[PDB]
User: What shape does this take?
Amino acid sequence: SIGIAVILVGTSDEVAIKDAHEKDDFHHLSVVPRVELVAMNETDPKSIITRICDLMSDRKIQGVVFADDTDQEAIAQILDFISAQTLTPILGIHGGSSMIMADKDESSMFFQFGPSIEQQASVMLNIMEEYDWYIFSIVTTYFPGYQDFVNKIRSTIENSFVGWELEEVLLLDMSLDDGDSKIQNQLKKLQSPIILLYCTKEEATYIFEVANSVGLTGYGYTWIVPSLVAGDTDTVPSEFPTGLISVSYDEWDYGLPARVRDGIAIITTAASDMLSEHSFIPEPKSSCYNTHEKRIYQSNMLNRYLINVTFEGRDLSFSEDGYQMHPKLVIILLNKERKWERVGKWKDKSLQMKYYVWPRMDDHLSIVTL
Amino acid sequence: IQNQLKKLQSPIILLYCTKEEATYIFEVANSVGLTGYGYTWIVPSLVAG
Amino acid sequence: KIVNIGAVLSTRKHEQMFREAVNQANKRIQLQATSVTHKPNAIQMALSVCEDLISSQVYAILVSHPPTPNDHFTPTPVSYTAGFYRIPVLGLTTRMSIYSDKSIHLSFLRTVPPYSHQSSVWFEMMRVYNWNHIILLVSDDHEGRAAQKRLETLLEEREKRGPKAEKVLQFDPGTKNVTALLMEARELEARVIILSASEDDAATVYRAAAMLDMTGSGYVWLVGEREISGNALRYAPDGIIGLQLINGKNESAHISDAVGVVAQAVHELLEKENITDPPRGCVGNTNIWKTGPLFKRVLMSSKYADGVTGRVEFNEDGDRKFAQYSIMNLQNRKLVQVGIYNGTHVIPNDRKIIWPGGETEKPRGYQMSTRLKIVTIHQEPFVYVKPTMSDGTCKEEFTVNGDPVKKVICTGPNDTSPGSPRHTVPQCCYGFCIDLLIKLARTMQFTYEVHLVADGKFGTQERVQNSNKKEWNGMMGELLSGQADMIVAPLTINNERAQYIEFSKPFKY
Assistant: This one.
């Protein structure tokens, strides 16, 4: 039997997930989906860890799909911590805000339902190429991941034959007022219609305020900000104008039941493949209090065979850091009604745009030719 | 005015008003990013003094 | 009020020492002390910290190094459960290489600087002895990459010749055949090697170097503190240069400095207007204490309390700057400090320093190797490819002028085919470019041994998404690899190939 746990905190998503056994797709007669839809209301670290240990000690837990409603990287932090200490792989199946690409260590790899920032930059450049606006600049603060992001952007620039001219790369910081004056001067010297930034929602509000103060509005200056740092909170402040566009996970298109079903299917297929190839079932010692039990960390890493499986006839592989190898995110653009509208759909690595032109805000004449 | 000055993009600008309004416009100009680096001005002395 | 500082200690003796230290620092609102011993696992440790959080939760949690060489598995969960509520964490002794992360660690102040300081003092020392070429190599992925990045950032300054680089090399911490890289290293010009590997890795490197005898009075060595251990000394040849920072194992002094700096920090934070003390609770506290960010900003801006580490100062990375480093050396198995480096003052101890290999004089720079490896390609009007005779030479033909062809012998996979590649018999080749190389050699007294390339390939900037990096493959690739020296083939010029290498004045149009 396969010990799977569905942990949920904050919200309530009691669904018909029990149809996994009714699917009847496991060919190997050694894996039984003994799921445990455990729910809770509190979100305290100590209580969560004690509940995780109790669940791992109750049954033979091998993979835990997780769901939540908060927004913090501490979830991924404690996930890496438990994967390093107890060596138990878990699954962040959209995890509320746990589907946020974050760094990890050489622990048991836990997959998160989110792409790398490099993929976000690539799809943003593809959308820009669909509009044929090959002029952009980079303005960012001292935020984590900036270096890798700008390096990936520069590599994508040097991998084409189009005049992608990076006007100016800016590394900033929110320290004092003289730095703010310097940022305002550099933004006045930007002169680029496409600007990309990556920072939290409060700093985004501040930079949008100072931008519309110095004269950067949604008239001709459009922005591209990744959703990992922006977030689809369904309530955009007045700072962000009605010209921003972002790409996020398919939360409005790939439902949470489908996500958890794909996660448990991946876990089941990986477990079946591992226990069929190696034919030796490891003993999941759930001690939580015995250091001598750490000697069980001698078998092959389960993450190796976990990140190289597929299910449901679709490529559902995982990257080295724990990202998704799967297309079909959702390109989100906020309209003038201060509401997020799903105009584009980055599905199958394609830009499913509409209207064949960017719907900008009397000087737009058409012509006939022959 | 700040938006139109951001959309100016000219290295030579001419203005004519009193000393207090000149101080105010210079303040808002160096706030929006108009300094003496490459943007020079020409103001008549009749209103500057 | 009372700010009961929660503290975790590895030994109860150090807990009593910290209690006495805070009792003495209370003289300078007052402060109390909350102490708890370390746990064998991260689960019990986190549970105890949560139990230590519900008690006071008004503190800047500090940590020290356990007797185990890990020094990360214990301070990591307390930092995680602190950053859960945006609570700062303090570090006294640990490997600050991996701990230097503003993203992973929310707020962390390392009393001991990481090996970036070692790279900086290595650069400082190299700027003294006028050595302009260094053969660097690393084994550890994370720490090695961080040290190499810091070294490259320091070398990116100065926008004499100036020490830029010779050859960067990476390796593995568990390998046993580093001789492959050491052969290419010794095949270079400069005998200046710098490594930052682990203990067993450094021992294996020392064994391989002793098998290669990399100490002939010219090999300058600069080794970090992570390899001056006795296990490496069992294989380390004498004369190498080791490093050792001040207050290495001074645990009580570090605790005194920590309690002093946190007393200064709390005295500076309690003077502000808004003070939102963190709630005394680990459960249900899913919010952000307003004292967190402001406390970090007021401790990092200008706070500097006296102690044992001199004029301590926190750089813009969460690490103590302006530290002292004893410049030791392996003067016949005696770690004598040849100098002391602190801040920017390069101060030698005026001791009789001996270089490895018995040499008493300062070794000079690279040795000019009068031997070059010329790569070429098959091209009818300029270079010719003819098979040799039985004995190994080739028919010395003549022209209408009766002058010798002055052919030369170049070994190249030239007689085989791309179907069955194999090292051929050296083929005898001649031509225009060959005569040009003859003239160049006769002018500069060279000792040349030219050879063709594997698959032709004048030059290509092949890129791929497998490794996300573009590399030169072909003649120019072999040139940039290090095995070749100069192109004498009829190579065209353009802006693309001028980026990596630089050409000379043309001899044809």
In short: The first strand of chain C starts at residue 5 and ends at 9. Chain C is about 30% helix and 15% strand. Chains C and B do not touch (no CB pair under 8 Å).
